[PDB]
Amino acid sequence: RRSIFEAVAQNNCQDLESLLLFLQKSKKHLTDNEFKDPETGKTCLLKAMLNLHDGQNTTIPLLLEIARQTDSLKELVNASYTDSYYKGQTALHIAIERRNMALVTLLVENGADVQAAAHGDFFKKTKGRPGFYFGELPLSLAACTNQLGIVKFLLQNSWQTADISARDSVGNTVLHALVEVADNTADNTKFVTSMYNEILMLGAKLHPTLKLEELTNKKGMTPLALAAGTGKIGVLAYILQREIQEPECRHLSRKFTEWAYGPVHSSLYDLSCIDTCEKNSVLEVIAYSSSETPNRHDMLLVEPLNRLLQDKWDRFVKRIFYFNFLVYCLYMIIFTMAAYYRPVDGLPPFKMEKTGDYFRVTGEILSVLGGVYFFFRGIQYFLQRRPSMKTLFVDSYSEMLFFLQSLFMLATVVLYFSHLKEYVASMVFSLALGWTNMLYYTRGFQQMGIYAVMIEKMILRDLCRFMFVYIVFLFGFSTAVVTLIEDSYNSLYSTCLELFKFTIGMGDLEFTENYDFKAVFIILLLAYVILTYILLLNMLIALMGETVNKIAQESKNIWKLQRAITILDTEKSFLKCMRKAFRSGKLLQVGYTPDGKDDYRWCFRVDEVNWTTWNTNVGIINEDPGNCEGVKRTLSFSLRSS
């Protein structure tokens, strides 16, 4: 009714007992269901914790008393909002947000399912609208709220234990939801990684045979891959450098130590779900990420990902990439002679007469083959990825320019057999693109690759800003000049062309006398060669210097991502050629699984030195008694026992 929400709102537990007496005399069951606030579904219970005072209403104990004596207690606590916008938000969710440890205890005693799915649009994915996504389940609310006490409670209370393994509408478990909630700030990162640990550690105490991190949501994404696909570097850094020193939660570690002789200590990083794995590799999810996907370029600076790629580089990709640079250089030397030595008489196609004219056809045939090759490699890149229209034009600057080179090649073939001299028009573009596209292969080299990243950035921010204003000025004063000219440079091309000679230092200030006003002609060109040459070109240099100062580290980390995409494509191009990827690692016994069996893992070694943490009685060292690779080790009867 109206007065009940008024009395449940106002902390006044006197009028309620009068209505305990009232609802006694009909049923309390449907009448409370009819006293659910329409358009929201709020029974009196949810209303109470909303209007709290110092962490207690004092009607909440009473409203439970009305429901325990008189039948049907469940339908008050299992009740929730009815609206589609708070759909499924039980009163248990309220106590978890308001940080009331007690009311979480009180409600779960009286039922209050700990698996109630807060479906509502407020509780769904980001939506571009106001809302807080935590994972729709009360255990995920507590984890994303800094309530660790409420986490441990809901799993071992006495009555109903939360499910670590349960999923939301979008399939995200609690740990997935710890990834969705991360926002790359330090205090969030400090927390989420702390709370990621505890549930992940708790899931070895309870349910010791699950491996939560292997759980995949509706989109087939694990918490690690979801941290890498969504730009979550702090969580990624945590999951990857994860070392847990506790014995029964050591198998959940991921950064191990294999020996420590003095300051030296050799760490092992697992490579599960990073190398060319089954579903979603962390390298693929980072390397083949959409362009927004924050910190694409920093997610690989997370150790061991640098060393792992630099391992693949120095072991098989470097020797393949330099063969790709060679076969492309030869291809450019052959499409260049076949073009330099083209026929200059008659119409195409051109019959063969001499031996020198035979060699070029081998160079012309073989040259079209690469165009067919670089044409399909752009179709593969299209269908293997399905890049959006955005991603297609904003981060794929290489594949555009090899595919584009390929189109001028095929057009050069279509026109060489259509009897038209425009084959040359396309054939020379395909050369100029082709040689410029050797700047692709500067990415096997750190200094030349970073140099070519700066070229990319300069073209996009500094030169595109420049060439707008320059073409506006050029076309602007150009029209003003040719308007003034009377009968030759009485054209808009030759005036725009002469006014572009100034910037390249070839401008005659007297390229016409065919005008009637000379002050007008020279005030107008001086205006031009001050605002374009003196100002706007020298300003460009100034802008570049500002740019170079800023993109120094950004260009090094776009380079490592460029090189990474080459490492992955090289792996993925040779599933058949050599065998796969040479596996970039070794299968080592890190310890024993919690069921006693061996824990063999594909692990990456990183020798490290430390001049401060001298003593460090580790114990977590997995093969100390042999202190290196050497031959097989003892396994060190310490912490492991099986």
Q: Across-strand partners of 53?
A: 56
For position 102 contacting its own copies by CB under 8 A, the verdict is: no
Calculated CA dihedral for residues 245, 251, 255, 256, nearest 10 degrees: 70
- Shortest Å, Cβ 302 to ligand TRD: 46
Could you tell me if 528 and 473 are in contact, meaning their C-beta atoms sit under 8 angstroms apart? yes
For position 439 contacting ligand POV by CB under 6 A, the verdict is: no
Instruction: List phi, psi (to 5°) of 454.
Output: -60, -40
Q: How many CB atoms within 10 Å of residue 287?
A: 22
Q: What, of its own copies, ligand 8IJ, ligand TRD, none, does residue 612 touch, CB below 5 to 8 Å by kind?
A: its own copies
- Shortest Å, Cβ 302 to ligand POV: 17
Quickly tell me which residue has 């649009």 as its tokens.
121
Please measure the distance between the N-terminal and C-terminal CA atoms of the chain and give it in whole angstroms. Answer: 66
For position 397 contacting ligand 8IJ by CB under 6 A, the verdict is: yes
- Shortest Å, Cβ 459 to Na ion: 24
Dist. CA 134–CA 125, nearest whole Å: 9
Q: In the complex with Na ion, which residue's Cβ is closer, 130 or 505?
A: 505
Please, how many CA atoms are within 13 Å of residue 188, restricted to the half-sphere of its CB? 13
For position 416 contacting its own copies by CB under 8 A, the verdict is: no
Q: What, of Na ion, ligand POV, its own copies, none, does residue 505 touch, CB below 5 to 8 Å by kind?
A: Na ion
For position 309 contacting ligand POV by CB under 6 A, the verdict is: no
Long-range contacts of 505-508 (CB under 8 A, 24+ apart): none
- Shortest Å, Cβ 371 to ligand 8IJ: 15
Burial 421-432 (b: 16+ CB within 10 A, else e): eebbebbebbbe
For position 463 contacting ligand 8IJ by CB under 6 A, the verdict is: no
Helix (H, G, I), strand (E, B) or coil at 269: strand
Dist. CA 91–CA 47, nearest whole Å: 9
Q: Residue 262: left (phi > 0), alpha (psi -120 to 50), or beta?
A: left
Q: In the complex with ligand POV, which residue's Cβ is closer, 35 or 440?
A: 440
Q: In the complex with ligand POV, which residue's Cβ is closer, 74 or 501?
A: 501
Packing angle of the helix pair 538-573, 446-457 (nearest 10 deg): 120
Q: What, of ligand 8IJ, Na ion, ligand POV, none, does residue 562 touch, CB below 5 to 8 Å by kind?
A: ligand 8IJ
Q: Is 88 annotated as a binding residue?
A: yes
> Contacts with ligand 8IJ in 287-346 (CB under 6 A)?
296
> Contacts with ligand POV in 491-510 (CB under 6 A)?
491-493, 496-497, 500
Dist. CA 224–CA 425, nearest whole Å: 50
∠120-121-126 over CA atoms, to 5°? 130
Q: In the complex with ligand 8IJ, which residue's Cβ is closer, 102 or 460?
A: 460
Q: What, of ligand POV, ligand 8IJ, its own copies, none, does residue 191 touch, CB below 5 to 8 Å by kind?
A: its own copies
- Shortest Å, Cβ 446 to ligand POV: 3
Which one among 115, 437, 503, 593 touches ligand 8IJ, defined by CB under 6 A?
437
Helix (H, G, I), strand (E, B) or coil at 268: strand
Q: In the complex with ligand POV, which residue's Cβ is closer, 191 or 559?
A: 559
- In 3D space, the residue among 227, 314, 307 whose CA is nearest the CA of residue 267 turns out to be 307
Q: Is 2 annotated as a binding residue?
A: yes
Q: Is 281 annotated as a binding residue?
A: no
Q: Is 255 annotated as a binding residue?
A: no
Could you tell me if 222 and 213 are in contact, meaning their C-beta atoms sit under 8 angstroms apart? yes
Q: Count interface residues toward its own copies (CB under 8 A).
A: 43
Could you tell me if 309 and 584 are in contact, meaning their C-beta atoms sit under 8 angstroms apart? no
The helix (run of H) or strand (run of E) holding residue 257 is strand 255-259
> Contacts with ligand 8IJ in 544-583 (CB under 6 A)?
558, 561-562, 565
Residues that bind ligand TRD (CB under 6 A): 335, 338-339, 364-365, 367-368, 412-413, 416, 423, 427
Using CB under 6 A as the criterion, which residues of the chain lie in contact with ligand 8IJ when the complex forms? 296, 395-398, 400-401, 404, 429, 432-433, 436-437, 439-440, 452, 455-456, 459-460, 558, 561-562, 565
